[PDB]
Ligand binder design. Structure first.
Ligand SMILES: CC(=O)N1CC[C@@H](Oc2cccc3c2/C(=C/c2ccc4[nH]cnc4c2)C(=O)N3)C1
Ligand SMILES: CC(=O)N1CC[C@@H](Oc2cccc3c2/C(=C/c2ccc4[nH]cnc4c2)C(=O)N3)C1
Ligand SMILES: CC(=O)N1CC[C@@H](Oc2cccc3c2/C(=C/c2ccc4[nH]cnc4c2)C(=O)N3)C1
Ligand SMILES: CC(=O)N1CC[C@@H](Oc2cccc3c2/C(=C/c2ccc4[nH]cnc4c2)C(=O)N3)C1
Ligand SMILES: CC(=O)N1CC[C@@H](Oc2cccc3c2/C(=C/c2ccc4[nH]cnc4c2)C(=O)N3)C1
Lengths: 323, 323, 323, 323, 323
């Protein structure tokens, strides 16, 4: 158990400049996101459905066609549920799997099982297709900058499956994808041949996106081992603003407002947190008004707020990686 | 498994017009409740105890005497405790027990055990005699309308026994009547005949009333699968206010404030929450000042705040049941 | 000059002991107030009206009948208004008119002129009949302790006339009675014979009551030069509370919360504030909901808040005067 | 006098049902407003200038073209500035000028004077070109209904000139146009012939729109004498939200928050406030981030918000006018 | 059982008069503490390190050298970890081991484990060296009034070992020391020979200090079985300030603000709280900014604040113990 797993604790960012930041804002397109990356996912897609495979497919296509060398794996597994053994599949996409340290972005790509009602279907526009698209669009924008990876640090995306409960929310029935992936990663030497260090050691920070796409989001600072990273998002939000690069956005309505949170949301991060992974949980409090209703559709998304979180996060992420 | 277990997700209320709302508000007497439904319960009544039987008896007596078809059950049972096994007895009172779906109102009729001090005795008026009496008085004031039940939905009242620790707060030592009732219903088919679905699948909402009856309470919006039902309690409070139907009450001192709450309080709902029942926890934050002290008596209850909440709850219930 | 004009800055109260707080609390009766002091005032009573007179006479009769040596001035006077010259009548009751220094309580005994609208008349029970009676009740309950005045410091009460605009709020039309007195006072020498000091140099503190009687009031700390007396009002609420001597009260519904207030509220203090009197302005923010409507009546007064304030006010006084 | 000037104190809105409110939302077009009402006004248009005359022509045109018998004036006048006697020109558009009572909407069409700088020009998008287009867009979107006026009360719109300081904001150099009309109207008896009542007695309510157009406004409740009407804007806003009729909106970013404000803001309402007209000051606090900067332009206006406020305001007026 | 173990529920404090408050203030020297108590604890001191031993014996010499009859104990023990079985040594110092009841104060004497970075070492000044000292200095400062213990109630201190995770926070890898000592007290009868009552029955209250020493702490009121003692820490801070006995202190920066908390903090009290011991968790929220970084050094400790907290705590202990 060397010392590299503690570098995370001293990692510091490579702050960008007004000129770079300008380049970053102009290099992301919320409309190409909307059509190419997000509209394909707005379909029923609970675990094991045909939706799950169409969306699982859409995702890999969008990643497969970019220049950076993304090592997609599919992590199909079996688990009991209240309706019996079902088959889930997580999507992991790694740059430099051999890099010892990674920064991770993660969301969930299942949609909650619901029966149809008045012939509408639940599709989870904010829970969590926008997150999925955000991530996909971030690899698409930052592609040329992400070739530069050929500090030992790289980037992983993760699209978890079975996040949502099948029937009735509880530890036995939720977060099926993650730990799984947690427990699996916890028990896989890293780097290879390592002897005491798991892939979780190498997880520098896990940025979980969830419930994004409604208007007027407020993200809290949930955890102390990541507060400094949360503060970098505050600073980025503020700068992109002062340079004029955010859209319909005022500071009296920031997204990253410093406000500690009492309790804990259960979400895919809990399997990695209770293994001492640092988590930046970008889930808003309060949830959207359209949470878990058939109105979590596209009509009710805010394109401005997503373009904005996209700029911020893209920036966050290149400064993390010293790119 | 059919699709009726999800009907609840889309149930909307039958909002009363003004005329109606005055009619409900002239319909409840805090003074009747105060002396016929509540004062009988202000007695030491920890489990096993004699006021435990006396209280049980009383409660039943007051239901029995109503027109509506209230079906009473007892649910004597037995659990280990820090002072050894003891025998509890839940009261359930159901209308239309073959109705598939029910709104549940609930509270807890035991009283914490405390040795006597200075010749004083704990009777928990807010914890929870008043809630008890508020249900009784609801069953009374809306009798004639609850008749009209002969969408397949009725009402059910539960008065749990053993809410309180015997010694010291802890899972193994608390929540005796509810952890059992929730397990027992979770393993009873409903409707009778069913092959996939429990009586829990049938609980549309559990409205749990606890710690009520002190001046100036504020209840938060604890859970998002009942946020819309919370928002109706707000809407009712405002509209019953603007019509002059509430007493000693301003909107600057309202009870249902859109104030979400960090983490959780442990109470009789937990058993049901984790089995997937949506919960409206009418507990206040902060607790009353008398909480768990001899000083939690009548002399400290705001009669005016209870009248007002009777009114609110009774409207809520008529609106849920489309009465 | 001399240096008693500054004693007011160093004057400190004699705080009371639990035992004595009980006597004061037990010593006021809100029902003897409600009927003996207040209900007579719930009449139309605008300037020149016949109510102006019966309330004027009422107020005097009530004071006249106590044992302490209250000296009662009428300051009838003439001032121009939008409908022309009109006669007004300030009421001033004083103990030890030669005592160099006095603490002053004050309200306005007039009510706004509104025509009759569908058989409803305006009586201003908050604005300011209740404050009038609170003063009367204070003089009453403290009568026996107030004898003990045969620091050169006594008490004065002022019921102003003509506080309310006749037509439409403006400086030229409002505060007819306190614009007068403030200025007649600044130019009356005190004590008799003085040569560079006025009756205003002797106003230690003007405690002005306005708009009191609605539920859930909240009073700001308006001026830094009286803050410490407001801090004392806080302390007296708190302790009277901790001792069980308030009704329907909690600390989360405090009246005096040390929130400060931005701008100013014009009222009978202004003519004094602007001449350097220290003012303790007990007016709530926000105003009562019934402000300046025909619903500002007895129906919508909160008996228990008033009684709570009586006990807080009665204590602040005795403390200030060392009685 | 007569009784009628007090009518406004008892006047209640004719609340609209869901179907109505859907019609109104659908009746206004933000793009039509944008292209044909607001873009002509985004010019340098300070008093005297060619802008002011064009802007003035443009308002009249757009009014003239409508079916309701609007009565345009041009009150021109002369007043002394720090640079000497300059000529101004208010705009008044009235329906039914014998209508003894009017609800008045008003804003300011002048633009503040700035030297050109770095080849830019101040054009005052939010200050107040949008408020001018909103009032315009309301006269159009409600024309069919405003025609019904051939309670005696109609609608007047006022576009004030010279609101902005010439050199540096002082009571002498500011509000040229409103300080003028305030007086002119306070001395123009109403209705013709009257003998004690002016044109200001017949202002039920002045709704001043100022500095509207930026993301995330929050408007305070400035005056207790119009607070019942601010509440309705709260109510309207909420109901339109509940019904799907607002865009990129959340209740946690409400526009009208029951937040009362401290000290006063100087604007075109002051000449009318201190003369007794009740005012609804729809100005935001805090001001737009681009206040009095060259950056206050079309580019930084949030079309979504203005659309939402258009609808809210348009509803407010029908409800006031019983259409 | 017996009736002695409910006494905790009724204990009132012996509140100190101004005159003793001043002596207590006078009597603790922050400069003494810093030099004699705290500075020696500022070393790398994780479990089973030499620092640990150094740190461990030092504590004891500071208690050994006092005149009160403290009874040290080293409850050394072994436990499994992510790096093998290791050894841990609690420290407990009791006055009156046979006193049925005890006010316990505790903190943690380990340091997290960190590799050395840029030649820098983690010493944990807040976490929890300062609280270790504050506790020492409490006993120095209070030695003479403690001797008065030759209500059956005395004082205990506990310096837990192993609080901190070795690798990654987790119920398996944390709180070693308290989890041990909690179970061991749950399992020890007391007083000797009792047959149904354990040491934990005679923990009247557990006052846990953690993360103290940084600028501008704020401490929530975490539990209700202990709220009323928080209220006393609030009335103590108030009076000590209102008397000019605190330094660089304003009430708009109180340490104990009446803000309740949502979620929960894992710390060395958990094992006592879920066993029914009342806890006053004096951990601030938020955490120090320097938490678990190398900057948690002496340079970054607010000496004014610590001295202020020393006084509050010393008063609390005395009013509890009726000294
Ligand atoms: C304040 C807050 O939001 N939370 C939720 C997370 C939890 O704390 C942690 C989160 C992540 C890593 C952590 C810890 C944590 C908690 C903790 C608690 C008390 C401590 N005292 C000294 N070091 C101590 C460390 C720790 O040791 N490592 C409290
Ligand atoms: C507003 C707020 O602050 N909170 C705390 C957690 C969450 O808890 C719940 C409570 C009751 C029923 C629930 C869930 C809940 C949580 C949850 C958390 C993260 C999610 N991401 C996508 N769907 C997700 C669902 C769920 O699925 N069903 C609400
Ligand atoms: C509001 C809040 O912040 N919290 C966190 C602590 C937790 O409650 C306790 C803490 C310490 C000792 C306790 C209990 C506690 C909780 C509790 C909850 C609901 C109750 N309803 C009636 N008595 C009841 C008792 C109890 O019985 N003994 C609630
Ligand atoms: C929001 C807020 O807190 N304030 C303070 C004064 C208020 O202004 C008014 C505005 C318009 C018309 C008004 C008055 C007003 C004020 C007022 C102040 C003290 C009073 N005491 C009794 N009636 C009284 C009437 C009055 O009579 N007519 C704004
Ligand atoms: C931020 C805030 O909420 N406030 C209250 C009043 C405002 O006052 C000012 C203070 C200092 C310099 C100023 C002005 C000011 C006021 C002002 C007010 C209304 C306006 N509408 C359009 N331009 C306008 C200009 C101006 O022109 N120069 C501050």
């Amino acid at each position: 158990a060397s010392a590299w797993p503690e570098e995370k604790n001293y990692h510091q960012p490579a702050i960008l400049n007004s000129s770079a930041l300008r380049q970053i804002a102009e290099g992301t397109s919320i409309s190409e996101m909307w059509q190419n990356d997000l509209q394909p996912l707005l379909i029923e897609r609970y675990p094991g459905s045909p939706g799950s495979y169409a969306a699982r497919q859409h995702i890999m296509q969008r990643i497969q066609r970019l220049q950076a060398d993304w090592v997609l794996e599919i992590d199909t597994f079996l688990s009991q549920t209240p309706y019996g053994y079902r088959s889930f599949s997580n999507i992991i996409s790694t740059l430099n799997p051999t890099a010892k340290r990674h920064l991770v972005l993660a969301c969930h790509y299942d949609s909650k099982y619901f029966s149809h009602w008045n012939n509408r279907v639940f599709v989870g526009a904010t829970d969590s297709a926008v997150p999925c698209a955000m991530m996909l669009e971030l690899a698409r924008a930052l592609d040329k900058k992400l070739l530069s990876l050929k500090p030992d640090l790289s980037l992983q995306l993760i699209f978890f499956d079975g996040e949502e409960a099948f029937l009735h929310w509880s530890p036995q029935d939720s977060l099926y994808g993650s730990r799984h992936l947690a427990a699996k990663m916890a028990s896989t030497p890293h780097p290879p041949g390592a002897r005491g260090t798991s892939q979780l050691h190498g997880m520098d920070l896990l940025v979980l996106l969830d419930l994004i796409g409604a208007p007027n989001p407020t993200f809290p600072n949930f955890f102390p081992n990541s507060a400094r990273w949360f503060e970098r998002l505050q600073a980025i939000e503020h700068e992109l603003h002062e340079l004029g690069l955010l859209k319909d956005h005022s500071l009296e309505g920031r997204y990253f407002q410093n406000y500690s949170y009492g309790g804990v949301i259960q979400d895919d991060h809990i399997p990695f947190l209770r293994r001492g992974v640092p988590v930046l949980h970008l889930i808003p409090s309060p949830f959207p008004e359209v949470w878990h209703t058939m109105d979590d559709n596209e009509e009710n998304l805010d394109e401005s707020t997503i373009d904005n979180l996209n700029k911020i996060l893209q920036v966050f992420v290149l400064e993390y990686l010293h790119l």
